[PDB]
Paper text:
One group of metal ion efflux transporters that regulates metal ion homeostasis and can be found in all domains of life is the Cation Diffusion Facilitator (CDF) protein family. One of the most highly conserved and abundant integral MM proteins is the CDF transporter MamM. MamM was recently proposed to function as a magnetosome-directed iron transporter required for iron biomineralization since its deletion abolished magnetite biomineralization and mutation of residues within the conserved TMD metal-binding site resulted in alterations of magnetite crystal size, morphology and even mineral phase. To summarize our results we present an alternative model for the CDF CTD mode of action, in which we propose that upon metal cation binding, the CTD induces conformational changes towards a tighter and more compact fold which allows the activation of iron transport through the TMD.
Examining this closed state model, three putative binding sites were revealed, in which Asp, Glu and His residues from the two monomers are brought into close proximity and may bind divalent cations. The central binding site is presumed to be the main site as it displays tight packing and contains two symmetry-related His285 and two Asp249 residues. Compared to transcomplementation with the wild-type allele, single point mutations of the histidine residues at the putative central binding site (H285A) or periphery binding sites (H264A) affected neither Cmag values nor the number, size and morphology of the crystals. The D249A, H285A and H264A mutants displayed a minor increase in the number of binding sites compared to the wild-type protein, which may be the result of an increased void volume that allowed the accommodation of additional cations after amino acid substitution to alanine. Fourth, we confirmed metal coordination by the His264 and His285 residues by ssNMR. To confirm that these observed phenotypic differences are due to true transport function alternations, we also examined the expression levels of all MamM mutants, their ability to stabilize MamB expression, performed MD simulations for dimer stability evaluation and determined their CTD structures. (ii) All mutants exhibited an apo-MamM CTD-like behavior along the MD simulations, and (iii) an absence of structural differences was observed.
Residue numbers in the entry:
A (entry chain A), B (entry chain A): 213 to 292
Write the structure that this text describes.
Amino acid sequence: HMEAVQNRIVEAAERVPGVRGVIHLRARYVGQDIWADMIIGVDPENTVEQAHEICEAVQAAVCGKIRRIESLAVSAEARE
Amino acid sequence: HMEAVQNRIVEAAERVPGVRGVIHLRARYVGQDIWADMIIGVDPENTVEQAHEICEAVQAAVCGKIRRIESLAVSAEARE
């Protein structure tokens, strides 16, 4: 339900080039809308700029696929 | 007072190689202890691993200089 929506968020994030898994996802309803914050893994040898580009790509992929999301923050952490 | 402690935190962070300013600092007292979270700027062309190393260096510099800090989280963002 919410679990259904979280699964969709993870799946959509994992399909973006450069994502090394979803490390963390917190999602909540504000009325009928979802507000979420997530942390993605990235290659430690990517540049900070590349990691920012991946996060922005995730934000666009996820919000394009899951139309109820009205706020999404995406950060990155090194992951082997 | 608290302003004195914040100034010390910023100064100590700015003295670590690789810091391109303090972007954000939130500090609060939990009893006599300080708990703080901060965001440092870094070179967009540093690797994610390098940025992690800078953040860890900041955590060590700051907590070494300001002994009342009992919790400090340090994250990075690209800054030109």
